[PDB]
Design an enzyme around this catalytic site. Sequence first.
Site, PDB file in Angstrom:
ATOM      1  N   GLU E 735      18.376  -1.081  24.771  1.00  0.00           N
ATOM      2  CA  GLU E 735      17.087  -1.766  24.680  1.00  0.00           C
ATOM      3  C   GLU E 735      17.008  -2.491  23.342  1.00  0.00           C
ATOM      4  OE1 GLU E 735      13.739   0.644  25.576  1.00  0.00           O
ATOM      5  OE2 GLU E 735      14.623   1.553  27.368  1.00  0.00           O
ATOM      6  N   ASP E 736      17.262  -3.801  23.365  1.00  0.00           N
ATOM      7  CA  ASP E 736      17.126  -4.723  22.241  1.00  0.00           C
ATOM      8  C   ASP E 736      18.132  -4.465  21.126  1.00  0.00           C
ATOM      9  OD1 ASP E 736      14.945  -5.838  23.586  1.00  0.00           O
ATOM     10  OD2 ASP E 736      13.506  -4.571  22.517  1.00  0.00           O
ATOM     11  N   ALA E 737      18.958  -3.429  21.230  1.00  0.00           N
ATOM     12  CA  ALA E 737      19.905  -3.129  20.170  1.00  0.00           C
ATOM     13  C   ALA E 737      21.095  -4.083  20.228  1.00  0.00           C
ATOM     14  CB  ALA E 737      20.383  -1.681  20.268  1.00  0.00           C
ATOM     15  N   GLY E 878      16.133  -6.971  16.881  1.00  0.00           N
ATOM     16  CA  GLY E 878      16.967  -5.859  17.287  1.00  0.00           C
ATOM     17  C   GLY E 878      17.378  -5.002  16.109  1.00  0.00           C
ATOM     18  N   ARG E 910      12.506 -11.795  29.444  1.00  0.00           N
ATOM     19  CA  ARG E 910      11.916 -12.689  28.457  1.00  0.00           C
ATOM     20  C   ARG E 910      12.174 -14.164  28.741  1.00  0.00           C
ATOM     21  NH1 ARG E 910      13.420  -9.294  22.874  1.00  0.00           N
ATOM     22  NH2 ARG E 910      12.526  -7.302  23.580  1.00  0.00           N
TER      23      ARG E 910
END
Lengths: 34, 46, 50, 65, 1105, 50
Positions: E735-737, E878, E910
């Site tokens: 997740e977003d990393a 991130g 997004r």
Amino acid sequence: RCPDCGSTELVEDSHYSQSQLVCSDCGCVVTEGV
Amino acid sequence: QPMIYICGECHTENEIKSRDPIRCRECGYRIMYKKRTKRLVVFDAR
Amino acid sequence: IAQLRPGQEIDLLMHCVKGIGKDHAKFSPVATASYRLLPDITLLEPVEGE
Amino acid sequence: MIIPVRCFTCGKIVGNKWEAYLGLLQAEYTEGDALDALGLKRYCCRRMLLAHVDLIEKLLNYAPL
Amino acid sequence: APIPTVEEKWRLLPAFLKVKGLVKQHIDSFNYFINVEIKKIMKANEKVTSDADPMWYLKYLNIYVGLPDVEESFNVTRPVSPHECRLRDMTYSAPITVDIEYTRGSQRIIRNALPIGRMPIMLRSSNCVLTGKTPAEFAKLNECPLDPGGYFIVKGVEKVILIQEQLSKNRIIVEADRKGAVGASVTSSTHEKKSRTNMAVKQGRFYLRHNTLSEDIPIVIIFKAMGVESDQEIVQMIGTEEHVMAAFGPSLEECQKAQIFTQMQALKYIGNKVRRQRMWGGGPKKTKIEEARELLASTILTHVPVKEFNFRAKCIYTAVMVRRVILAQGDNKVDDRDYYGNKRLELAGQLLSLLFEDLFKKFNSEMKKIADQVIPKQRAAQFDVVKHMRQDQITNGMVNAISTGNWSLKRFKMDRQGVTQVLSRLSYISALGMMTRISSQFEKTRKVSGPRSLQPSQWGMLCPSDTPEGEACGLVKNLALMTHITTDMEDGPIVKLASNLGVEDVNLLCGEELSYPNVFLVFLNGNILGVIRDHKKLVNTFRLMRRAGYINEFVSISTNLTDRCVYISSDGGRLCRPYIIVKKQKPAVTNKHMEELAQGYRNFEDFLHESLVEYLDVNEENDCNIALYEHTINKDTTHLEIEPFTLLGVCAGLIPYPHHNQSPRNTYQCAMGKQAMGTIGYNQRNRIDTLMYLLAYPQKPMVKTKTIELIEFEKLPAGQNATVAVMSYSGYDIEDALVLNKASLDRGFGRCLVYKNAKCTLKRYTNQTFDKVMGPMLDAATRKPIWRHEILDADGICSPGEKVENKQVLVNKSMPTVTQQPQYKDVPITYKGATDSYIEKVMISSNAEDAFLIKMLLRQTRRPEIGDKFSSRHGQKGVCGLIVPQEDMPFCDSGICPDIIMNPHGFPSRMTVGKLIELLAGKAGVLDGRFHYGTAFGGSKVKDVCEDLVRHGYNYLGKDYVTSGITGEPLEAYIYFGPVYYQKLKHMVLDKMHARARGPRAVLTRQPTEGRSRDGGLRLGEMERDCLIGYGASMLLLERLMISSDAFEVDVCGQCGLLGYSGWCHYCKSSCHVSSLRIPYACKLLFQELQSMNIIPRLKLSKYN
Amino acid sequence: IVQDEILAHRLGLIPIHADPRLFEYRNQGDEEGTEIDTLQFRLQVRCTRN
RNA sequence: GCUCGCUUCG
Ligand SMILES: Nc1ncnc2c1ncn2[C@@H]1O[C@H](COP(=O)(O)OP(=O)(O)OP(=O)(O)O)C[C@H]1O
Ligand SMILES: [Zn+2]
Ligand SMILES: [Zn+2]
Ligand SMILES: [Zn+2]
């Protein structure tokens, strides 16, 4: 003087934001907290 | 003991003692930096 | 390494020791060490003309 | 501030090809042909040299001296 | 047959930026304040005299502000640079002097140069030393040439006065009340008084409410009091429509119920409803009718002027207001507050003008009081003001108002806060965007959700995407790239041209003409200018005259056909935008004009004078037809848009291809770019701030917007271009990393520098003793300084070049305890820090008060690790999830390994296609050695970069054949490789990591402190307690909230139920019933406070069994 | 003007033409270094006006 | 060290 060993080597050494006057010979915590 | 400082615009070594008005000769600038130390410093290339 | 101006000085000593690239990338001897599969283009039918 | 010695992705020595690149800018060479003549085949070194800004002289203009 | 298009049209934008634009607003406002407005304020209070001892006066002749100087030297001034003011923690001000003439002993004595105050000088202003300087001269002054300026420097800190937004004054507002009643309100504001008078229809009849009246009175009584006594004339003034008379009938009936039929009776009725302002000093002597008439003439509707007690204009104004209320009482045409055509922007100039006026009035009052107290009783030694003209009043007032930011004007009763804010030096973009900020009058404390919306009126004026994400969403905004704020005009030629254009005087005709369908009312800044017929001719002639140059180009004219009102606005603060004039489907600007502009034959002022480009206001553009492009121009077009990408602001300009992304993504990207890490300026090395973040090897972006070239961001980048591959790897980027390459970080990628400041002061006290720095306390055993005093030099001050560890002294400061031998106690400046720091420089300065200021600039070199926050210029913030080695990274055929691996799953939710387009354009550019443009509503197309990719031998879609580095086998799907401009943020895990031992506690409540700088512990909030309750863990909740936080043992007496001490009850004078009890300390504090409140809690203890 | 840590990082990335097979790995600690497992490079540059 | 304001963070 230190209450345990009677030494006069009382140094003000803070351990991770903890003001602490402690004996330098035996490590007896004389005073702590400010 | 000679304490040395550096001016902000002339960059000349000025020796002033304690309790002196911070100034520099041949100018009037009042920003006085301290020279770099002479002690050995070890750095890691990491 | 760097760019200087009159008055400035750079004085230093550098100690170099043996090391492998796994510890740090500065020990990597190869800039680009890679491998690729050998291509083999084949024509299913004879192509001619423009 | 200054041109890095090593490329971020691959690691090819690129710091020694900066000033000569500037010479190619002092000459009539464009960006692409100069980067080709410098020996940068992969686009990572091309991005390293092209997108780099020379801020060391602007700081030395503010140096004590 | 397509319409021809001017390709070089965008060249109009940089020229406009040459005289106006981003930072010129505050500069021009401050220059107008210090060059024109201050002289007007001085002229308004040129003469001040006291009632006692007449024929005495103090006359001001001319006031000057001069050049900025420093009062360090003994009674001597000296030119000082702003950087020196930043270093010495002083203010950058200029001495306000004035030449005066007065009478000491009835003999006229004149002074030609007498200083009275110190005005803080805005940077890059007219009197600032930085203006008219070359970059070499900027380097000589240690100031960045790219610095926007326009901010004040007070006591070493940089304060910026934000642009204030407020409702326009002297305007009728028709709005619904809490109960649904559609009433009216008018806030008539003159230079002296602001009065908001309202009108309601609570009972089918119109009542007028004002703060000076005890009870609201019918409007017909006020009509009769203001000169017009016939009811027929009142009805004609209100309107001749049948529904208008039907609605106004109840008011006439209620008026006829009473015996009010003449002006005297109505004035007496009004005076009966007037209350004295708490026993106003002076004999009234039957002022009732007089007070009523004065309130009607002066207090009520201040903006509507009465020549000599002639309320004809005021009668027409209130009749038009009643007519508007009647018309709005039907179809719900309620005006909205969020319409920016009724908004006004106050810059720093108007605020400083009001503040200087208030301070000068206070100074004059103080001088008059001193005169009245000194002159009549002192001696034959004639009193002179020169011996009493305190110069610290205005200086201290200005300094405090600019520094603290709270403005309290009792003469205007204005109590504002947050006017000035600390300039953010996170990056160049941060300061450049904060300089063009605008705060709302709403002053967010509650969920209004009515101004927070994005109104269509913000087109071209304010940036739609740029807004702080959080509680301040929608109430803090940014100006557009191409915008201007108007100033005040003389308003004379406007009135002259309006009178000469056939506008009939309102006093010549009755109100019945106001009800005609073809008669249009013409206003002027809220004042009824008159009536007119065929308003099209009037508007066309006024616009043509403004284009010709006989009328100021900022005077706006608009027409409202619903209300049939022609508004002429000439007050300052209005937003205007340049537009190309279009006449008969062809723009006035041609290719030849743009060629002349490019060659230097003409400038933007020549376009303004030749009727080619004109400024349009929101109210004016409401009636005009604007075309976005040339192909959109139709028959009914009056103006042409210069450039669409000017809609975005400064922060939004950094977004490559912003029209391909989502709006929350753009907002988050602006918010993160305001926090982007990078270089600040060319003088960032000599600059010493409390916190500075610098990038080791900053690189300019490959996909740069034209706004970047305009703001010169490429000279000061705040990020690096990294070869990002969009793929899933090792599951450490869920997740977003993002996954970083170890070899990349090892070679300098993302390397950052953090500079902190440590300041100490050695001040001289009242007694002749001073703070002194002792030398390093050498250990007699080893003849060397101790570990704590290891880094100190011979003078007790830490020397630059060494490393500082935790709990080490930087300045061995010792201060006296007296204020006979002086007794010095040590208060050394210890370094609190988890990691080591390196001293870059130590600056020692001396103020006028002999206080030595020492500033150490500590430097820390940090490498990206797990927990560091990274941005990708598209709102895709991130955190580094894993750092894999180079060999573990996948590789292409050429051998390139990616630096950053980002998760693809963030794209579908997004819809950040702009990121993919930027990646493709950057890859094409680094392949062909070009810089592609990601300009909003334009830029390089996908076809061009695809052709550039196919020409160089790469794939036309970015996806390349990639072999897995781990298994050595090729991947089944191609990987999307390309250079992306990633920017590192100031949010680091090293600074945010916190751990709390027992530690200290607070004195009042014995609980851990709050902040990390205060070494506080975490807080188990109410909701955490609710969760622990829901889980049912009673022992864990008890241990957390009682044992581990505020445990204590008190002594309670079992007889009286009160709290004892040391096993003894003072109340009962016994100790047999005293027993120990465990309790939270906050509970004991509550019990003691309740006992102080006479609410005595009596505790009846019992055995635990 | 270049920072000391940045200068050391740039110097670390500079490759050395020394043959690694003729040296050995430095043991844990031993910052003084021995003849077998270290090399020394002196860099002393003083910039001045022409 | 108390207070308040701004600012960010999720
Ligand atoms: N005022 C707040 N109160 C409680 N939680 C908050 C607040 N502000 C942020 N958070 C935390 O941050 C999270 C909000 O993220 P969310 O709104 O779901 O995504 P987002 O910020 O819209 O991101 P996108 O714009 O969708 O990319 C959820 C919450 O735990
Ligand atoms: Zn000097
Ligand atoms: Zn490379
Ligand atoms: Zn008792």
